[PDB]
Amino acid sequence: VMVEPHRHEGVFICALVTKNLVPGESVYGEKRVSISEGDDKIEYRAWNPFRSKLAAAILGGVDQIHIKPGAKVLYLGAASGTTVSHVSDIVGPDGLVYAVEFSHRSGRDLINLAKKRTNIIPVIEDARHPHKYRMLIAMVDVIFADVAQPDQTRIVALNAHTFLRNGGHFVISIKANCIDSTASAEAVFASEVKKMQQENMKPQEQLTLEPYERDHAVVVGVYRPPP
Numbered sequence: 001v002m003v004e005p006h007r008h009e010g011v012f013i014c015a016l017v018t019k020n021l022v023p024g025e026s027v028y029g030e031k032r033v034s035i036s037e038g039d040d041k042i043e044y045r046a047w048n049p050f051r052s053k054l055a056a057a058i059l060g061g062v063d064q065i066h067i068k069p070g071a072k073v074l075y076l077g078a079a080s081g082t083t084v085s086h087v088s089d090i091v092g093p094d095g096l097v098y099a100v101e102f103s104h105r106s107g108r109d110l111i112n113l114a115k116k117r118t119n120i121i122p123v124i125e126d127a128r129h130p131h132k133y134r135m136l137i138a139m140v141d142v143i144f145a146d147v148a149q150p151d152q153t154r155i156v157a158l159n160a161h162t163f164l165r166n167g168g169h170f171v172i173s174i175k176a177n178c179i180d181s182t183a184s185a186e187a188v189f190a191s192e193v194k195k196m197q198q199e200n201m202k203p204q205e206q207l208t209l210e211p212y213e214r215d216h217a218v219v220v221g222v223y224r225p226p227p
């Protein structure tokens with residue numbers, strides 16, 4: 001066998017690859033590996049950990065990623081769809097990925113990606129004001145975000161309070177240099193974990209992303225709002 005399933009469901013390994021929901025198409029120039037044995041054919045896409053914090057996290061040995069076939073996902077800061085494309089591969093045609101991006105430039109890449117992928121919903125909106133787009137968002141199982149400013153963990157939490165089910169999960173990368181360049185990476189990470197806790201987003205694991213990123217963490221946890 002030439003592509004083995006990874007511990008994480010929907011993730012495969014040769015290095016890290018996902019099953020291409022759109023056979024024949026690359027999203028960001030990634031290699032595509034197709035394996036045929038008779039009439040059976042399956043195409044995978046290379047998942048670059050120097051571009052995608054999530055792939056770096058999986059390679060780094062993260063225990064859970066909480067996306068699987070059928071999962072409903074809210075991705076804040078979807079940019080041009082790099083990481084979202086692979087989340088879309090994993091959740092498959094019965095899952096759903098809401099891809100929120102403020103940038104209109106990035107948004108056009110996202111809409112283009114979503115033309116081919118029925119499970120992506122581009123939402124070209126400011127995640128600071130979820131009320132503007134709340135009527136489009138069915139309640140999700142998992143939220144993803146890259147936090148790069150000192151206000152963004154709260155912005156993620158306001159979206160969790162609006163859209164994330166009780167007992168759903170979050171996967172949040174943290175770019176310490178962008179949050180506070182005058183603080184140590186460790187102090188930024190502790191401060192962001194504390195901001196999470198104060199919003200009932202309870203971390204369950206965390207890791208840094210060396211060698212792919214410097215002073216970049218990924219935190220995985222569970223949302224436990226009060227009644």
Ligand SMILES: NC(=O)Cc1cn2nc(C(F)(F)F)cc2c(=O)[nH]1
Binds near residue numbers: 076103153156
């Ligand atoms: N040009 C930009 O504004 C990039 C960007 C950052 N960004 N951060 C979040 C947050 F993490 F807060 F959820 C959501 C977004 C997003 O839509 N776009």
